[PDB]
Amino acid sequence: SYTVTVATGSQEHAGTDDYIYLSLVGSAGCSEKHLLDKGSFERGAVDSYDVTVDEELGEIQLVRIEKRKYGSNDDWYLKYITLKTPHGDYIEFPCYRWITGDVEVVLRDGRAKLARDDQIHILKQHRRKELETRQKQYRWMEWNPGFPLSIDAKCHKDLPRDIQFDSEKGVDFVLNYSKAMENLFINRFMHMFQSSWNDFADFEKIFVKISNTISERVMNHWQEDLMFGYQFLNGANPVLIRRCTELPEKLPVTTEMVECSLERQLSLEQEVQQGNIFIVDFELLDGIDANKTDPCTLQFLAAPICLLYKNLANKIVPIAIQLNQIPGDENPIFLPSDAKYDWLLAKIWVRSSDFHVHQTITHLLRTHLVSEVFGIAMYRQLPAVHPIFKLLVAHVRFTIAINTKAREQLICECGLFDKANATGGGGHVQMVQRAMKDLTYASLCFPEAIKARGMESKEDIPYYFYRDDGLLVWEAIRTFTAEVVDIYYEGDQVVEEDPELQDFVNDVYVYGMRGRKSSGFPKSVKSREQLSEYLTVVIFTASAQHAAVNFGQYDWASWIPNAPPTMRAPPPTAKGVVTIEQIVDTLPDRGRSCWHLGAVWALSQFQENELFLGMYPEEHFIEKPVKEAMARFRKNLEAIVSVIAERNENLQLPYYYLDPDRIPNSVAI
Ligand SMILES: [Fe+2]
Numbered sequence: 001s002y003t004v005t006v007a008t009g010s011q012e013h014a015g016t017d018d019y020i021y022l023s024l025v026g027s028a029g030c031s032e033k034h035l036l037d038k039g040s041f042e043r044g045a046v047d048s049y050d051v052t053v054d055e056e057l058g059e060i061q062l063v064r065i066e067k068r069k070y071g072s073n074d075d076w077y078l079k080y081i082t083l084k085t086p087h088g089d090y091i092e093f094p095c096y097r098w099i100t101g102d103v104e105v106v107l108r109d110g111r112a113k114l115a116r117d118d119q120i121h122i123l124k125q126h127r128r129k130e131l132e133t134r135q136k137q138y139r140w141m142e143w144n145p146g147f148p149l150s151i152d153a154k155c156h157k158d159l160p161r162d163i164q165f166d167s168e169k170g171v172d173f174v175l176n177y178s179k180a181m182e183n184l185f186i187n188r189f190m191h192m193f194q195s196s197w198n199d200f201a202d203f204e205k206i207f208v209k210i211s212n213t214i215s216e217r218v219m220n221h222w223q224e225d226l227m228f229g230y231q232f233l234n235g236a237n238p239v240l241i242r243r244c245t246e247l248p249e250k251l252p253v254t255t256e257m258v259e260c261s262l263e264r265q266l267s268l269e270q271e272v273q274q275g276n277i278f279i280v281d282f283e284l285l286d287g288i289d290a291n292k293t294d295p296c297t298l299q300f301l302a303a304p305i306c307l308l309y310k311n312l313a314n315k316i317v318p319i320a321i322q323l324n325q326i327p328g329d330e331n332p333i334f335l336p337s338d339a340k341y342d343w344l345l346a347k348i349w350v351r352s353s354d355f356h357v358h359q360t361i362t363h364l365l366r367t368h369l370v371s372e373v374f375g376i377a378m379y380r381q382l383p384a385v386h387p388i389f390k391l392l393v394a395h396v397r398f399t400i401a402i403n404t405k406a407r408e409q410l411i412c413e414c415g416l417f418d419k420a421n422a423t424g425g426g427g428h429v430q431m432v433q434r435a436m437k438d439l440t441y442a443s444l445c446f447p448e449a450i451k452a453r454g455m456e457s458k459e460d461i462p463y464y465f466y467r468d469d470g471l472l473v474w475e476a477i478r479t480f481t482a483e484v485v486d487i488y489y490e491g492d493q494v495v496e497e498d499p500e501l502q503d504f505v506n507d508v509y510v511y512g513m514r515g516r517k518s519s520g521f522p523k524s525v526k527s528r529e530q531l532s533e534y535l536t537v538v539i540f541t542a543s544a545q546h547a548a549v550n551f552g553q554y555d556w557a558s559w560i561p562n563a564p565p566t567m568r569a570p571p572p573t574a575k576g577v578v579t580i581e582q583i584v585d586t587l588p589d590r591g592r593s594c595w596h597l598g599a600v601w602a603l604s605q606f607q608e609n610e611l612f613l614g615m616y617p618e619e620h621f622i623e624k625p626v627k628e629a630m631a632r633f634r635k636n637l638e639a640i641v642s643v644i645a646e647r648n649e650n651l652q653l654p655y656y657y658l659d660p661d662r663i664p665n666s667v668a669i
Helices: 121-137 173-183 200-207 213-221 225-234 268-273 340-381 387-395 399-410 427-436 446-452 465-488 492-496 499-512 528-550 553-557 580-586 590-603 624-648
Strands: 002-008 019-026 046-051 060-068 076-084 090-099 105-108 277-281 305-310 316-322
Touching: 002 019, 019 076, 060 076, 060 090, 060 121, 090 105, 105 121, 121 340, 173 399, 173 590, 200 213, 213 225, 213 553, 225 316, 225 340, 225 465, 268 277, 316 340, 340 387, 340 399, 340 427, 340 499, 340 528, 340 580, 387 465, 387 528, 446 465, 465 528, 465 624, 492 528, 553 590
Parallel strands: none
Antiparallel strands: 002 046, 002 076, 019 060, 060 105, 076 090, 277 305, 305 316
């Protein structure tokens, strides 16, 4: 007799009352269909049955599951099935899928296999038919012109059940944003799009009720040059600043203009040569359409150039700001020596520009859309039994779902994104298109990305915590993927000859990245080392990178003056005119402020049962060597947690974002 154990998921709607039939596919043969229990498989339940067979089957190759309607359709989430055979063998069959009753589900045992491992028809047939089904199920589509290709579905409910959120409205922008505004006691402002705050105190009264540790600090110090500069290294969008190797001709700033800022008795030009000058250049925003979806509110964008300076205390501070790209009499170079509110407003404009690039490029394009490309390629080209599928499936969990929700509710035409954002209404689509033209594989390789911006020296630039922690997590993942690769690939030739791996890599290149020559993405992978790097790009982007740029949004943007989602007047074209009252009226109205707060709060939340880096409750892998690799991965992450903990004890303002205990496995929000 076989002992057959069936485990139902613990999600809300995991249970089913329908009929479940099970049969066993063996070498010598097959078993008859067996109806199970005629009862209910409740959520969280494990059901085991005693099954005697009418024939000796030999070694079990596959388990088939079939769900038939009893009443109405009732989704069933199947975690796994295990067998205890007459011969005393214990076999596990990982599933972790929604069974809708539409189709039969056929499972391999959990041992990871390359195509070259399968030689008998039973297995080859199953493998090929699985991929045929996958490629009918998961298809590419161009959502907007020039975008990376994404899933062929126009709304969340159109997705295959297997890649939907566990609930339909569980993670939902419309609902989550509105609940957020309720929790922040700002519900009453949700429509006040024509009302400015009376003054900073007016917003402050609203804000102190809902501030956390960091945003309260921002409230108290946002006007300081030190805190302005700090954010380029350790804020929510610490990926733009680079070391200037020569002053741009489009920024005609002189030593005499910034002499008061310089502390080494050197000319500006010589400070550049010493590597003490840094720059943030928002040329990408130049020519982007401003939000016009509200005809009663004019909104405005800039494209600033910010020149920064590493002072004697090794802090990077702003010394000059030109708010538009082309120099001229109506495009002043503002300085910390200007009138109080001239310099402040200039900084605010830079902060606003930083927020635009963060939301659409750093966050949306470079973590969300990228991760969806890897995910779709994975589903299309890698069967469940493949070791790379088992490795990566955990790191694209809910990614296609959250992205489809966004395209359905947030960033579509007339979506929520259009309410508060100056780039809303088409501008954000333009940014993605233009950034895509310059998106490279190298720029996703963390250590290379840091060096490409000239920010790698810990000696010259000691307070770049995003860099430090990022490098540690990157290496931890690189070590882990390398061990996994070495377990299932005996050499480089085996990697090169893996046809499914090549098709995976090829799908990312041709469809995901549109077959763009300058993308730098591999067309194929032909060594264990190259494969390891590739897998690290996928996992790091999906986990660490997304965490670093996502979960600090409320911390840094909740005090709106430090991250305005829009501006209601053009950049000042002259000095000595701006007043504090004008600034208040330029900042977002109460309405757009409300939606802004709601959004950045909602996006910064962890789920109650969030899965963090290295947590793999879904045992797709069942073999001991890889389990031990995972164990070492976890131990390495713990060591990093301690490193970061000790580093943060000596900081004015702890940088927590890349603490592995706080890094989710995947892009899920
Ligand atoms: Fe995100």
